[PDB]
């Protein structure tokens, strides 16, 4: 077992210059997923059971 | 349209799933990829004139210079018919020759 | 409620598990915190940097941008804020993360939008100079970019005034 | 009657704990609100022009 300072991830520096653009040329399409919940178990209670 | 609302990059259609107490919902998207880089000028003059791009932006591979639009690489050659005029070229700053 | 007491814990034994769910609650708000900061904070897949020349068509960012010199790589505007705004079997936790990193994030962020526009929110960031950027946002606001390119001077000198007189009041 | 005067406090100092869980669960929910808000207007405001 290590412990270690985490890292916020990797690091690079774009290329930034006053006339020059990247543009790309092709492309991907992907799926992703999301899950919401949207309901939760309906209960009752009696006093005088209880 | 509003961004990262529902799938991250460019969203193009969902489909709903159902859960035993919830939704899922699969997200498509649109992706780009394979970026290149290229030489760029915000105006061209001619004539004395200055054209401006309707949609789209000006490149060059070193020469030549051409008009793509900006999600996905397809030069195409500057003409009078996807190009508009505005005065002449003095007081813009980036302009080059063509 | 017992202060190290043998039989006063004695006679709270006999209450049966009021404490298990205050610490359950308690524990739960501060894994809520955590995961409110995270989720708002990061959202960049990696860590960019602005560039060592900063020619950005006459707009001035030094305001804004971390300053190297100061040991807490913080902007004039985040010391300022920072500036202004000032047991008995309690405790208090450290957030997971500290000041460091959320500047660094900030800076990330701020660093990706002046540099390759909204394209880093979607895919790979893409580099274009900064005019080119004000040109593809006012043609979004309905307004030729013919405009900003004949007006540059005069944007940017008012955006210029706009944020130094944002310092001055706060 | 000692431990009818502990048992006093004890009810006592249990009340007033309860009552402290219970606000700092209210206004977490809402601080909770404002941060989701946060999240969205960063989302969109500053990735993109809305
Ligand atoms: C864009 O990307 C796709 C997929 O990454 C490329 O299609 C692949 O091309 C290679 C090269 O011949 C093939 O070996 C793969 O089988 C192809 N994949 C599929 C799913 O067909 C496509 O060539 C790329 N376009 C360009 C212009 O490079
Ligand atoms: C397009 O050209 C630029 C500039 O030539 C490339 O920028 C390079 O970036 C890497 C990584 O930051 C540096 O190590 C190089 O020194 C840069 N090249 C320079 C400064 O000439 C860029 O990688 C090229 N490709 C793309 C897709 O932008
Ligand atoms: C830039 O791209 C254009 C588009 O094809 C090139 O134009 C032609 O390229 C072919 C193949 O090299 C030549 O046979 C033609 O003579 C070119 N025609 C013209 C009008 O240029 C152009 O060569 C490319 N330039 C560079 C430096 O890559
Ligand atoms: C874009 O940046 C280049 C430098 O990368 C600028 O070129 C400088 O222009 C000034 C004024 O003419 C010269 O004094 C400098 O010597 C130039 N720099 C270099 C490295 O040659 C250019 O002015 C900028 N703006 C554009 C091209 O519109
Ligand atoms: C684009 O072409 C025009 C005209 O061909 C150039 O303007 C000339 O600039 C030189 C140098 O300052 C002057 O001596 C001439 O009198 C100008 N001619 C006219 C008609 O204005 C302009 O310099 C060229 N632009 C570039 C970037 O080469
Ligand atoms: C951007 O604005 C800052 C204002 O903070 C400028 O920094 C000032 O520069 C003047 C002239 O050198 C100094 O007298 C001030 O003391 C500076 N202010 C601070 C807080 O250091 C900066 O020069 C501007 N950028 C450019 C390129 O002009």
């Known amino acids: ?50 | 349209k509003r961004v990262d609302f529902c799938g991250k990059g460019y969203h193009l259609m969902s489909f709903p799933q159902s859960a035993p107490h919830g939704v899922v919902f699969l997200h498509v998207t649109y992706v780009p990829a394979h970026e290149k880089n290229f030489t760029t000028a915000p105006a061209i003059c001619h004539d004395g004139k200055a054209h401006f791009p309707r949609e789209g932006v000006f490149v060059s591979n070193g020469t030549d210079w051409f008009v793509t639009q900006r999600n996905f690489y397809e030069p195409q050659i500057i003409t009078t018919d996807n190009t508009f005029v505005s005065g002449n070229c003095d007081v813009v700053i980036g302009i080059v020759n063509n | 409620i017992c202060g190290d007491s043998t039989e006063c814990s004695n006679l709270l034994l006999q209450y049966g598990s009021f404490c298990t769910q205050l610490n359950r609650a308690l524990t739960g708000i501060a894994v809520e915190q955590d995961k409110n900061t995270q989720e708002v904070f990061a959202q960049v897949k990696q860590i960019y940097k602005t560039p060592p020349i900063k020619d950005f068509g006459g707009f001035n960012f030094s305001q804004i941008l971390p300053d190297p010199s100061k040991p807490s790589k913080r902007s004039f505007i985040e010391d300022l804020l920072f500036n202004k705004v000032t047991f008995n079997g309690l405790t208090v936790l450290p957030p997971l993360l500290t000041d460091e990193m959320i500047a660094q994030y900030t800076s990330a962020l701020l660093a990706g939008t002046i540099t390759s526009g909204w394209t880093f929110g979607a895919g790979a960031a893409l580099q274009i100079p900064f005019a080119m950027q004000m040109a593809y946002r006012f043609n979004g606001i309905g307004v030729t970019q013919n405009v900003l390119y004949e007006n540059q001077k005069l944007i940017a000198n008012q955006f210029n005034s706009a944020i130094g007189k944002i310092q001055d009041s706060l | 009657e000692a431990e009818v005067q502990i048992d006093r406090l004890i009810t006592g100092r249990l009340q007033s704990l309860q009552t402290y869980v219970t606000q700092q669960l209210i206004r977490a929910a809402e601080i909770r609100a404002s941060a989701n808000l946060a999240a969205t207007k960063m989302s969109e405001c500053v990735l993109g022009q809305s």
């Not at chain 1, 990797?10 to 309901?39: H, K």
């Open chain 1, 1 to 50: 077992i290590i412990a270690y300072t985490m890292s916020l991830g990797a690091e690079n520096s774009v290329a930034y210059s006053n006339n020059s653009i990247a543009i790309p040329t092709n492309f991907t399409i992907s799926v992703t997923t999301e899950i919401l919940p949207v309901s939760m178990t309906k209960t009752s209670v009696d006093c005088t059971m209880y």
